[PDB]
Design a protein around this ligand. Structure first.
Ligand SMILES: [Mg+2]
Ligand SMILES: [Mg+2]
Length: 758
RNA sequence: UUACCAUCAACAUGGACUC
RNA sequence: GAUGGUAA
């Protein structure tokens, strides 16, 4: 998986190397003579006989881990506390793991959680926060405190502790006080305000530091009401709180906040009843206040808090390590199992891939250090330009003059790019209702029949009109369309740049080709998949598919597939692949020898399925092409990763440069894979992208796959410069977003020959 | 909707005795 | 989906 083709570079990570002292992780199968109910009794039974095992036992009910080898067979006797039964317990050795074996990993995490809790850091969700850090803002009685997202991973270099910084925001005023203020300002209605602010928001109880999301609020129950506890007694809420925590609810006329189930609860709602009725007096809302959210000045300071340069990130990690080292009990807790952290974050060596060359018609230039070429694209002719001679400009009356300059500005910049433009057909609208827009566009589209593009200027910021326009111009009446918001063309001194960007976007939509990059693999075909998940819900997830259909990767064939269940995804993707190969044969008169797939939108949990089931199913489709066996290469791209790279400058840890590749000591232990940071980072730490090769029948050397990925990162035409993921994946993401969000339908097959989805 | 990037929030994968 | 940053 490791290759070298570029200058070495010294990086550091947010990984602290863990060191194991013994090789003694012995697994034992523990069996009890009678069927023993409840794991607590079993754990106590094992506890009383600790003289045999010791006191470093990690026990979960069936498998017992020890750092010391017992006898081959161990038999012990004990007595039950309830039935006074004679329990003969057996301990038998199962296997001798190495200290880092991917199976003794999920209790090192338990030990670490115990350590962090021993540092007096509260557990909220899955993070460790420090209430003894009260940097207040006192604008809405707010409090921010910092914590860490920490875990113990293992990679092909060994064991590591992955640590990241985070911050939690909590109000000082209780829920009761804020609803009292709400009702204080108004009096007629306290439904809308209190219900909207509370329902859907997440609160925290400080007597146990536990978070609950509040499904509803009822003005119908009081502490005098009661609930059945442990099926033993119907006790009042006041008495239950007093007994468990000894706190008094002062004023009893309040609502109760209902969090009815936690619906999932692992497999399902075995504890279906749920029905949590939290008090409002002892709850505190969590989040950034919306009134604060709208206010810019308040948001500025909090943004300064959240955003950290790599130096501050490294300093926070150093502080955590020093805190762990100082507390002797935490160190003893870690070293009971033989583990011992290092004194600084692990320092690694990556390399910087060579810079690519970008080609335009009659010219070529080597990409600069910062990987951005915005000026050259707008200053020289593109590979292929489509002249517009018949296009319409729809504009409302109030924007009339504001439209004119745009057209004028589009007549001064089309020269350098080599694109030829004629004056449009101006269309002034009687009114701004969406019905008028759709009628006028439909009328010209139906009558003229020669329009090559429709440019619509929207006056007010409303999305329904945009959706209607796109539904008309991409589903019902296929013709490429551009939508311009009047604010963007409202100010001079930015009209030239936006005009150039818009013109390049229209040229791409018409079937143009801006720039290209050298490709060393002959007869290559490149594919990109991506998925879209509805934030609203409705649970229809759309998968977009984009495949190159020429030898320079300047033409694309685009398809989209709609399906909620997983039955039809694979065969619809097979249909898409067959259509793509047929189009490739038609254009080139030969089928591709090598096919590279860049799959995205796959979480870790399904990474095992996609490798084992879906890819052979797709490969089965080549059997309808008369003995045609290509050489496939399939990747899996993960954007959301929690690993940070800091380039080690002579003095402090700085942001790493673009084009950094890492394949050492941090990658997955079973796949071939590598981390690649390609885009130019300006705000924060450099988060790379993880590429996992789940199939390689072409026997491509690692250098070649990395080079091909970096080259494909240069071919996204909506942004001059390198992007995070390969261009086909971003194209698929945009296509899926447009089809699932705006159109609620699949675009007409007439438009799938160009990049209409820009 | 001229774009990209960032925190947040949805989302999806799941993951994990007390009112 | 909000707020902020950046751009011939
Ligand atoms: Mg993507
Ligand atoms: Mg667009």
């Amino acid at each position: 998986k490791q290759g070298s083709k570029g200058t070495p570079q010294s990086l550091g990570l947010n990984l602290i190397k863990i060191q194991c002292h013994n090789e003694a992780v012995y697994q034992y199968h523990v069996t009890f003579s009678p069927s023993v109910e409840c794991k607590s009794m079993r754990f106590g039974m094992l506890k009383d006989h600790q003289s045999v095992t010791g006191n470093v036992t990690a026990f979960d009910g069936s498998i017992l881990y020890l750092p010391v080898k017992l006898q081959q067979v161990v038999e012990l006797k004990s007595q039950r506390k309830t039935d006074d039964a004679e329990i003969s317990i057996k301990i038998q050795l199962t296997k001798i793991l190495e200290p880092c074996s991917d199976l003794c990993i999920p209790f090192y995490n338990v030990v670490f959680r115990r350590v962090m809790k021993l540092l007096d850091m509260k557990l909220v969700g899955r993070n460790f926060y420090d209430p003894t850090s009260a940097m207040v803002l006192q604008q809405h009685r707010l409090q921010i405190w910092p914590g860490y997202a920490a875990s113990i991973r293992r990679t092909d270099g060994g064991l590591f502790l992955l640590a990241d910084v985070s911050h939690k925001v909590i109000r000082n005023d209780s829920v009761l006080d804020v609803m009292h203020a709400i009702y204080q300002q108004n009096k007629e209605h306290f439904q809308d305000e209190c219900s909207k602010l509370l329902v859907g928001s997440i609160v925290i109880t400080r007597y146990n530091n536990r978070t609950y999301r509040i499904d509803d609020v009822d003005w119908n129950k009081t502490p005098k009401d009661s609930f059945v506890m442990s099926d033993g007694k119907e006790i009042t809420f006041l008495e239950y709180y007093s007994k468990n925590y000894g706190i008094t609810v002062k004023e009893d006329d309040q609502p109760l906040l209902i969090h009815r189930p936690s619906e999932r609860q692992n497999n399902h709602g075995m504890l279906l009843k749920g029905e949590i009725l939290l008090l409002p007096e002892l709850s505190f809302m969590t989040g950034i206040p919306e009134k604060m959210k709208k206010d810019f000045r308040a948001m500025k300071d909090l943004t300064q808090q959240i955003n950290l340069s790599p130096k501050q990130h490294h300093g926070a990690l150093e502080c955590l390590l020093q805190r762990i080292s100082q507390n002797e009990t935490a160190s003893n807790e870690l070293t009971r199992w033989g583990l011992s952290l290092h004194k600084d974050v692990h320092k690694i060596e990556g390399r910087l891939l060579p810079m690519e060359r970008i080609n335009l018609r009659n010219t070529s230039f080597v990409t600069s250090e910062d990987l951005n070429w915005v000026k050259e694209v707008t200053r020289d002719a593109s590979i292929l330009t489509i002249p517009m001679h018949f296009w319409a400009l729809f504009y409302p009356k109030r924007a009339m003059d504001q439209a004119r300059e745009l057209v004028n500005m589009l007549e001064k910049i089309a020269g350098p790019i080599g694109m030829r433009i004629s004056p449009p057909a101006w269309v002034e609208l009687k009114d701004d209702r969406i019905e008028t827009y759709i009628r006028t566009i439909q009328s010209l589209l139906g009558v003229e029949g020669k329009i090559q593009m429709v440019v619509c200027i929207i006056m007010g910021t409303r999305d329904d009109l945009y959706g209607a326009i796109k539904k008309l111009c991409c589903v019902q009446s296929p013709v490429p369309s551009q939508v311009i918001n009047v604010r963007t063309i409202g100010q001079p001194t930015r009209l030239r740049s936006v005009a150039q960007k818009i013109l390049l976007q229209m040229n791409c939509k018409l079937g143009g080709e801006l720039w290209g990059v050298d490709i060393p693999l002959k007869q290559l075909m490149v594919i990109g998949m991506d998925v879209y998940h509805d934030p609203s819900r409705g649970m229809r997830s759309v998968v977009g598919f984009v495949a190159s259909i020429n030898l320079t990767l300047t033409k694309w064939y685009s398809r989209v597939v709609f399906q909620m269940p997983h039955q039809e995804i694979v065969d619809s993707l097979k249909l898409c692949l067959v259509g793509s190969l047929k189009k490739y044969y038609e254009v080139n008169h030969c089928l591709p020898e090598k096919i590279v797939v860049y799959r995205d939108g796959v979480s870790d949990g399904q990474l095992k399925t996609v490798a084992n089931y879906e890819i052979p199913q797709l490969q089965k489709c080549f059997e309808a092409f008369d003995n045609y066996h290509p050489k496939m290469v399939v990747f899996v791209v993960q954007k959301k990763i929690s690993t940070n790279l800091y380039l080690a400058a002579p003095d402090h840890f700085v942001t790493p440069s673009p084009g950094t590749v890492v394949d050492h000591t941090i990658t997955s232990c079973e796949w071939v894979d590598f981390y690649l940071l390609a885009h130019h980072v300006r705000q924060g730490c450099g988060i790379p992208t993880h590429y996992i090769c789940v199939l390689n029948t072409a026997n491509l050397s690692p250098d070649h796959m990395q080079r091909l990925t970096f080259k494909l990162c240069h071919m996204y035409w909506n942004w001059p410069g390198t992007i995070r993921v390969p261009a086909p994946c971003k194209y698929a993401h945009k296509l899926a977003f447009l089809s699932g969000q705006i159109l609620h339908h699949e675009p007409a097959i007439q438009l799938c020959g160009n990049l209409f989805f820009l």
